[PDB]
Structure formats: structure tokens, C-alpha cells
Prior knowledge:
In chain A, 39% of the residues lie in helices and 21% in strands. Chain A has 13 helices and 15 strands. The first copy, chain A, has helices spanning 4-11, 36-43, 50-62, 74-78, 81-84, 91-117, 140-148, 166-179, 206-214, 271-287, 307-317, 325-334, 341-355, and strands at 18-25, 30-32, 67-69, 126-131, 155-160, 185-192, 218-225, 237-246, 254-255, 258-259, 262-263, 266-267, 299-302, 367-374, 378-386. In chain A, strands 5-4-6-7-1-8-15-14-13 form a 9-stranded mixed beta sheet, with helices on both faces. Chain A has a two-stranded antiparallel ribbon with strand order 2-3. A two-stranded antiparallel sheet of chain A has the order 9-12. The interface between A and B is large, with 68 and 68 residues.
Amino acid sequence: MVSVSEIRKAQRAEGPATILAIGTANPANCVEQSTYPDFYFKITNSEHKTELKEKFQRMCDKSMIKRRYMYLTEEILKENPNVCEYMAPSLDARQDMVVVEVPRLGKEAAVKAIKEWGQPKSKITHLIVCTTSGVDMPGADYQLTKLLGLRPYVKRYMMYQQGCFAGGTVLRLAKDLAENNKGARVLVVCSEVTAVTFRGPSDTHLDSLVGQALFGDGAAALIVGSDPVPEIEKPIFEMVWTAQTIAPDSEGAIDAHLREAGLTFHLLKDVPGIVSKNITKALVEAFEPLGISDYNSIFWIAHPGGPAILDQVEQKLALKPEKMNATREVLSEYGNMSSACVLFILDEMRKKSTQNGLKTTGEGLEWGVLFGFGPGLTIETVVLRSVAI
Amino acid sequence: MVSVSEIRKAQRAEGPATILAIGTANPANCVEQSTYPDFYFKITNSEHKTELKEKFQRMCDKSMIKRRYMYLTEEILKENPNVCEYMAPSLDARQDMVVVEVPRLGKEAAVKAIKEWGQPKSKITHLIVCTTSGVDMPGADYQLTKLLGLRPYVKRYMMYQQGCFAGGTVLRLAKDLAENNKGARVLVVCSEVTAVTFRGPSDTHLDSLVGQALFGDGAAALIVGSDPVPEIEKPIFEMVWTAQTIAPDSEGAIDAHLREAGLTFHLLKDVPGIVSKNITKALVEAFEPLGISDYNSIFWIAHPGGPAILDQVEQKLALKPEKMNATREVLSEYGNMSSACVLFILDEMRKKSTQNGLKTTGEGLEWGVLFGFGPGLTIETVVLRSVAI
């Protein structure tokens, strides 16, 4: 009696998934990088570890981060000595912090995106929440539904423990949700808080120490939908194609385990080298089909895992130095905010493009690429089209 | 120059997402329920807690579970006294177990589904992995890509810490991935291992004790795709519509926190009552549009959180006793396997329907419903169409 083909035709959307709003938020505590080596070796009781401190100083000076925003303060750290050691039982304390902070910080970004979008929050049909900072049941998705007053029937996607490539993952996911469901409007929230990874220094664990120089806190929210209502909704970027891959010869490059002492961070391989050696393949797969081979002719968003990733990618491809401007500006002002980073970079790029009177939201160019890099070694690729004005 | 509308038309699939294969697996250790009260009070050193033991005996006798499959053995428990206490530091040990067992057990189910499907594993384009048992970076998705030899460019969706409704969530997700991407073939793996939740008994925590009577281990895998190749691929069920909602007046009904002592389990409200009071609304939303109001005229798959959920739902709706047969058979033989449960029930239903010469894979009926129930209180609804033969 019932036609499933009719139902399917009527149920799906028509156009490309489009980013219609972007809002960001960060903890109020601003931590300068210039003075971080002294602060960090003092709050973790490691002033006697002189050679290690010099190594950290060099890491921080080479980081290309001016400041980061951190939920953790000196007062919180003084009440949690176990978080200040390299390896002490402290997950319960860290979970107590991030179970509340992740949704709190996410709500601030989401309210900003919803205001920019300008449409009723009751029209949000899908919610994607992503964090690498803590886990809980009901998750941060349920908390954000409650905090924001979304409809109880919002369709939720709780992305936990994903790592630094997940800014690309939430876009890859939102694309399918928006494009396959007529009228769908997806709220996407990436909210990352370093209270689960912060820990004291150890001279036999320099990889962990690198994480202490680079990771910072922040949340970014998007509204994504197909078939934007012309002159009511305002397209910013369109997604056209996505991919995810694991680079060869990268087993164990980046591992992070959630333990009784919190989330540990290890680096066993040359991440900048692996990314640089495999970025061309990723570009060819995405852009060969569009007939584009000049990678300076597209706009760039790259997860700034560290400055060396960016520097080696630029060197490998012969990118003009300006291609990574928006990426490096976010790195400089906020550090590596894991999954939220690339979403801050999209916001920086469309704001600077609009502010400076360029012709599109992608620096005056039509096509662009967004990359996420993280454990596996995983590379996420999102091909974007900019919007006029 | 480039047409995004042409790209979008060429990139998407045409028909409904279809389940094309189902395979399951369980740990080899079979634990009888009849003798479980004695075993459990003996391995946890609680034989002196006589009134509590009587309460557990009654829970087990009312469970309607004959046996469960458990990775944990007496030998493993004797090497882990901290797992045998109600509340002792033991997450590191539990994580070490499940980081390996979840992907191992998932691989066994996946290999069975892939064999049934019969097509090259290189045609798997998307991978969804779901577990409520442990977390790691790279996740179980990366481990299963490696173990199975999937292509490194498989698009992965790592569903961690979701809870008991997630059998419905992975179907809701697979539907969009398959339907919006031409040629996509999604491997879906739900793999649940109770080593993170097992713990000793406590007389002030009877809700936790209920979990010890009900949860068991197992993994189920699916191949999902749109546009099946006729006579090469073999449709089993088609997905037509999905929903997810949070029941009113259910805040805190089911909470589970991942702590230094592992995953705790709490029940603060009447779950069978909440599900029963809200199941009609869910059915009306799904079936009003199809013109169906007789809920005995559709085939049923319900997450068997406990037997009282099933009993009250049946009573509420006046379901014939046979509607929940396949659900109760899985409950009886395997217990509550969290997200994988409903996927075992689909397998039981299509096997018994085929075995007994019925006209469709949905007990001879055309339309059906699958429900997941879990933290939030969340209800997941999936409307299914059966296949002839």
C-alpha cells in the first residue's frame, strides 16, 4: 500500500550542506605564553628540574602561540595537587570539572551561533556535540539540549574522545544529516577543555611536555543546513565533498589514553613529516575531480596541531606564506584547541574576508580545503565553496 | 565554472538504507543465571551479606535471563580484587581489558556479517563502531579497520559512552550515511563488554545491583547500504524513518559515570513506567503518517533493558504476548547486551521468520518498529519495512 520511494523523495533535502552561522567561546582566564614556563614549573613544583625547564622554555618560544584560554586557574590547581603531578590518580576530579565546563562553554558558543542564525531554536532538528575532554551518561549532548532549551526530540550525535581531527569529522557528519533530511538544521558544537590533560612535567616524557605548551580551551558552534531560505538565512560556506584516511607508516604517531590519572598524551613519530608527506595525496583526491591543481588558488584551513605541521606543509607544497594566515592567527591567539580549532579558523577567515571587503568569505577565492589531523594518524578533508560577499 | 548541483546529484544514493547482512559474536564463557547469585556473592567476598544475597536471588529469578556470555572469568576476577569490590580504583585494569576485547569481539561479528554479505571488504566505505565499554585514542574504529584490513580511507564514526539506546542510534546514523552517498556500504559494529561495569554488591546501592543481574557481553555487526544490487546483495530490512526523544519527567532516570572505579550504574526513577507512558507518543509519531494505528499489525524489536520494560509496554498497548517473542528470546539467551541487543533481535527475527517459512523477514508482516531505551531518558525509534522471503 505505502510507497517507500515517495517517502524517500519527500524526506530528503536538495542542495549542499551549508554553514549558516558560526559562534565561539573561551574560558575567561587568559594565560600568556611568554611567562608560561615560569608559571607552569612553579605550580607543578618542578623548579628544581632546570634542564627540563629550559627545554619547555624552548618549546613555548617555538610554539607560535601568544596566549591560550584555560578553565584551570592557579586556585583550582592549588586545590588539586594530584592534577599537578605527572602521574597521580585524578580522573574523578578532572571529570567533575569537564562534565560541567564542556557543556557550559559549548552553550556560550551555541547561543552566539543561534543569535547570528536568527531563526527559532525550535527549528534545530539535529545536534552534534564533540569533545575530547571527559565522558558521561547522559552525555554533553543531553546537557546542551537542556541548557539551551532545544526540543526534546532533537536528534543527537555525541562524539566523545575523538581527538584533534574531529573538527573535520563533525563537518563530515553534519553534511550527511543536513543533505539527507529536508528542513534539517544541525547545531554543531565542539567544546574542548584541557583540565583532563594538564599534568606536571617529567624528563623521560618530553612528548607529554609538548602538549603542555600547545593545548588550550575553547568551543565553537555552527548551524548547518541544506536549502537555505534566501535572504532570511545567510550562507557562509558550502560543503561539497569529504574524506577521512589513515596515513601509511604512522602507527602510534599520536596516542592518548583515558586513565585513572586523566588523559595522557604521547607522540611516537614525526607528525609534521607524516602530514607533509601525505597531504598531496589528500589534495589530489579532493581536487583532481574539480580540475584544480594549483593549491595557492584555493583557501586554506588546517588544524594547527603545532607550528611545524603548518611550516612543513607550506614548504612541501610551495604555498605562499599568506595561505596559512587565518590558521596561524587562531594558533597565536588561542593555541591548539583540538576539534574546535578549525571552526575558529573558518570564523576568522570569513570575518577577515568580510571586514576587508573581499569578494567571497574564502579570502576572495571560490574553492577551499579544511583539514583535521589527529590520532591514527588520521587526516580529515572537507572541500568547501565560499559564498559571495 | 563547476556546478555543485551536478556534483550533489551525482554524489547521492537513490533508495532507502537497507540492512544487507547481520552477524553476531559473544565471549566464550557462558554464565548460567540460575547459579549466578552464589557465584557472584562468592567471587566478590559478600557471602556474609545474607539479606542482600536474597535480594539478588530474587532479581536474578525475575530477570528472565537464562544465561549471559561474559569476558570476565573467575580467574580474571581473582587477579583483580579491586574490580570485585563495590568501589575501588580499577579503571586502568578495566580499560586494559576492554580496549582489546571490544575490537576483538567486534571483529568476530564483523567477519560473519561480511561473509554473509559476500562482497569485497574493500567496498566498505563507512564504519560505525559503538560501545559503552571503555574509551581510547585511536579508538576501536581504528582498531577494527586494522584488524579487518578495511581500506585506510574508510570513513569512521566512533560512538563512545552512549548507553543502551545506541542500537537505535547506529541505525539512525547509518541510514543517512548510506542514503546520501551513492555506492556507500556501511559496516556497523556494536560491541559491549561488561568488564567496565562489573563490581561487588552494596546494600545501599540496589540500583547498581540490578545491573549485575542484567548486563551481558556481545557484539553485532551489520552491512547497510542503499541501492542493493539485485540478486547479488540480499536485503533483510529497510529503514524508512527515525526519531530520538527525551521523555518528560525522566531527569536522572538512568545515569552512568566513568570514574576511577570504572563505570557506575544508577537508577533514580521508574524506567518501565516512563517507557510505558511514553511509548504511545513515539508510535503515533512514527505510524500516524503511514496510516497505521494497530500496533499488533507491525513487527516489534524493543531493547530489553529489563523484563519489566517489556511487560509494561505489552500491558500498556495490549500487544499480543507473541509480539515480544524475538526480543524475549534474546533477553533469555544473552541478557541485556546494551547497544548490541536490538541487532541480535533483528537477527533472531529474520532467522526465525525465514526458518519457519513466513512470507517476510518481519514475521510475515510488512511494517515494523525498533526501539532503543537508555540514559536521558532517551527513546530511539526506527521504522522498518520487511523484505519478502
